[PDB]
């Protein structure tokens, strides 16, 4: 069916008003006069009065300018009545379409856009996105077709255009390879959004792209060589201070130094990174020995906490470590010398020769031995030869100086040098026992009760060692057999039993007891024997 088209009216028209849009007509007008009216929003409903119709001619008119961004379409209904007022048609729906005009500039969502990217980004790497909108008709015109372009870039030193933008989506990707934070850290681009596919209304915004740091700068030692000086036996002593520089961002993992000693298999040295200066403090973990190695040529490599992006050349340093010679005490070889010498050793004779060795390889050392600990004053030594000679008579039974069967002495060895040191050694002198002691009774004072006495056991003591203490022979001398009788306690004959032979009077008595071990005799006259006034056991 032939129908009425959409009635188009451009927005922002300028007059004259009212202006005809379209004329309508009922063919009932052949029968009689027809009168036309319009209803709907924009006619008799808000916005009232925008569209009117001439009642007798049927001309639809618009009375004022239109705005598509406010109201983009109007729906009216036309009516036809006769001179009686009855409707002679069904209401005819009419569509008013507000034709768009390019009267809205694009607008960026933000005045300043922020972006970030890392160094050495390959081309085609998304960095950031800018966006803009346009209020005009995007369906039937290009008045809202935004095209994005880059206008300026500050600076342009690595390349005139380090970035590219897509006309449709507005993303910013890298387009050139040379991106470096150390040389150019920030970029300020001015972007432009233009409608009509880039040929119309314009607007600008700024995109601030910052460059993220990467570990693409190796640490470089400021002096490639160093010279240190450390004494011999010392630990955690600072030898030297390492100096490095890193072009990357300071106080970041790509700037902190990690020093590693290459040729230190023994682990004598240790290097720690000073956080304040990013320096390398080289210390001695262990103690050094000058006579072992006098000089050290250490190679230390510096890296970073994080691995190296790309591939550079690791800087390696050189530090000469000079050990200082410190005088050390002579060490006796062996530390304790054991020599077996008979107790009845000649006074002038020589026991042994105790020699020490000087660790300091540098000579001019004069070792002079001297007697140190000699509580019995039994020993003398020669300062040059170190020969130990006797001075008095040795005694194995001396319980104060010879605790065990061995006698302990100490010999020093004073050296020569700026720090005079004294090495001390021990002499273990075992004394061979000779039968030079004779037996004695352990209880020399014995008590017996006058009535019914109790026999008293008398132990026998001999200071020597077997077989110079074996059996023992007892015998009562100076008479005394008439009043007293002795007899061994057991077949081992280590002790005897004394008892009165006769009924004796109360008083003090003296008995001479003669004891012998193996042809060594001793009469112990002080066998003081009292006869108490008691019966049985005698206390006193």
């Amino acid at each position: 069916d032939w129908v009425i088209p959409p009635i188009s009216c451009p927005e922002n028209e300028k007059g004259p008003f009212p202006k005809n849009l379209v004329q309508i007509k009922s063919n009932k007008d052949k029968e009689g006069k027809v009168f036309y009216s319009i209803t709907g929003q924009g006619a008799d409903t808000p916005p009232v009065g925008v569209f009117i119709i001439e009642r007798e001619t049927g001309w639809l008119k618009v009375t004022e300018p239109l705005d598509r961004e406010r109201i983009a379409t109007y729906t009216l209904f036309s009516h036809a009545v006769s001179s009686n007022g009855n409707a002679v048609e069904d209401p005819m729906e009419i569509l008013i379409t507000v034709t768009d005009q390019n009267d809205n500039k694009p607008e960026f969502t933000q005045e300043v856009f922020k972006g970030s990217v890392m160094e050495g980004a390959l081309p085609g790497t998304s960095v950031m996105e800018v966006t803009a909108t346009d209020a005009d008709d995007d369906v039937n015109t290009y008045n809202a077709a935004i095209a994005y372009t880059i206008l300026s870039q500050d600076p342009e030193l690595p390349d005139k255009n380090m970035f590219t933008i897509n006309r449709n989506t507005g993303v910013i990707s890298v387009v050139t390879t040379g991106l470096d934070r150390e040389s150019f850290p920030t970029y300020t681009l001015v972007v432009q959004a233009a409608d009509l596919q880039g040929e119309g209304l314009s607007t600008t915004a700024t995109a601030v792209i910052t460059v993220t740091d990467t570990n693409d700068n190796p640490p470089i030692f400021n002096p490639t060589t160093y010279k240190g000086q450390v004494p011999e036996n010392e630990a955690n002593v600072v030898i030297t201070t390492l100096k490095v520089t890193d072009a990357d961002a300071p106080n970041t993992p790509a700037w902190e130094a990690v020093y590693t000693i290459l040729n230190d298999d023994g682990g004598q040295f240790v290097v720690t990174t000073n956080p304040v200066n990013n320096d390398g403090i080289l210390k001695t973990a262990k103690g050094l020995d000058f006579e072992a190695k006098q000089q050290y040529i250490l190679h230390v490599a510096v890296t970073n906490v994080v691995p190296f992006e790309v591939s550079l050349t690791t800087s390696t340093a050189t530090v000469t470590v000079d050990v200082l010679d410190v005088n050390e005490a002579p060490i006796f070889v062996p530390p304790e010398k054991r020599v077996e010498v008979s107790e009845d050793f000649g006074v002038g004779q020589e026991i042994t020769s105790y020699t020490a060795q000087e660790p300091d390889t540098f000579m001019e050392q004069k070792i002079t031995y001297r007697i140190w600990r000699d509580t019995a004053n039994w020993l003398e030594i020669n300062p040059d030869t170190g020969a130990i000679s006797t001075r008095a008579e040795l005694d194995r039974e001396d319980f104060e100086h010879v605790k065990n069967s061995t006698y302990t002495a100490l010999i020093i060895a004073t050296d020569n040098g700026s720090p005079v040191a004294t090495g001390t050694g021990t002499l273990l002198l075992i004394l061979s026992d000779v039968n030079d002691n004779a037996p004695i009774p352990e209880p020399r004072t014995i008590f017996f009760c006058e009535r019914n006495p109790k026999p008293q056991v008398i132990n026998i003591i001999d200071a020597d060692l077997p077989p110079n203490t074996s059996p023992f022979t007892a015998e009562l001398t100076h008479g005394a057999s008439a009043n007293w009788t002795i007899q061994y306690n057991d077949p081992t004959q280590e002790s005897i039993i004394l008892k009165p032979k006769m009924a004796l009077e109360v008083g003090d008595y003296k008995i001479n007891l003669k004891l012998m071990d193996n042809q060594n005799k001793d009469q112990v006259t002080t066998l003081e024997v009292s006869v108490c006034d008691c019966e049985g056991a005698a206390g006193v």
Partner: antibody, heavy 119, light 114 residues
Framework: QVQLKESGPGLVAPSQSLSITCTVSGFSLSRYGVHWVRQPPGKGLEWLGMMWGGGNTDYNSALKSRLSISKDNSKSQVFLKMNSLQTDDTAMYYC?????????????WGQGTSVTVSS | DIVMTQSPSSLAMSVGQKVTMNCKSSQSLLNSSNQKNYLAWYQQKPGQSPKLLIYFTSTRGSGVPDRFIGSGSGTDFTLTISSVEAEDLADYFCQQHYRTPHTFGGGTKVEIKR
């Protein structure tokens, strides 16, 4: 009963903005177009711009970059704002009403407001 | 913009004489929808706001006597005061209300000879 009344500052410093309010009564703003006309001392009339009932606006071609016309239907007020005023902007400022029956010719005028541009 | 050229700039007549003002438009002001030329005349007596004297070229405004006659068509328009009275001294401005931006003429100052 159609009445218009201009109200604004009498004095405006050079390189400063001007803001005038046109209060109306006796008609609805959505159905009429309100104009802004100015007249320097001893000079002729200069059409500044107008605000249609639907909200559309038109301006003087030479002064469009300095002018801004808004309104508030509920408050029955039309607003004019001009930027960077100089001595040549010292003028009497009128608002006037109009509607489509008379082709939007200005058939009701306010009494005008005086705006002097001087420091 | 449409340029309105008004002549003469000034006239001086004694009471009873005929006043003639001309106004030229740079383009046609005829609206094909209603066949009316959108030409207006305004009268501004000294110290007063402008008054709509004529609109649609020949239609008189409210409270305008019959001696004020608007005429013309195409791009040539004329305001006539058939017999000028002493009260008619004013500035007269022609204005096109055809297409925005609306534009005024230079004005014709009417003075009274006595």
């Amino acid at each position: 009963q159609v009445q218009l009344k201009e109200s604004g500052p009498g004095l405006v410093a050079p390189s400063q903005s001007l803001s005038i309010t046109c209060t109306v009564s006796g008609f609805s703003l959505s159905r009429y177009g309100v104009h802004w006309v100015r007249q320097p001392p001893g000079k002729g009339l200069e059409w500044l711009g107008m605000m249609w009932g639907g909200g559309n606006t038109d301006y003087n071609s030479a002064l469009k970059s300095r002018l801004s016309i808004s309104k508030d239907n509920s408050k029955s007020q039309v607003f004019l704002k001009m930027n960077s005023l100089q001595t040549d902007d010292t003028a009497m400022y009128y608002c006037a009403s109009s509607n489509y029956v008379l082709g939007y010719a200005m058939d009701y005028w306010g009494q005008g407001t005086s705006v002097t541009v001087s420091s | 913009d449409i340029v309105m050229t008004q002549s003469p700039s000034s006239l001086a007549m004694s009471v009873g004489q005929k006043v003639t003002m001309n106004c030229k438009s740079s383009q046609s002001l005829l609206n094909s929808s209603n066949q009316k030329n959108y030409l207006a005349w305004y009268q501004q007596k000294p110290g007063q706001s402008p008054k709509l004297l004529i609109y649609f070229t020949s239609t008189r405004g409210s409270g305008v006597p019959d001696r004020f006659i608007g005429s013309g068509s195409g791009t040539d328009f004329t305001l006539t005061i058939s017999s000028v009275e002493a009260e008619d001294l004013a500035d007269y401005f022609c204005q096109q209300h055809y297409r925005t931006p609306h534009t005024f003429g230079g004005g014709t100052k009417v003075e009274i000879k006595r």
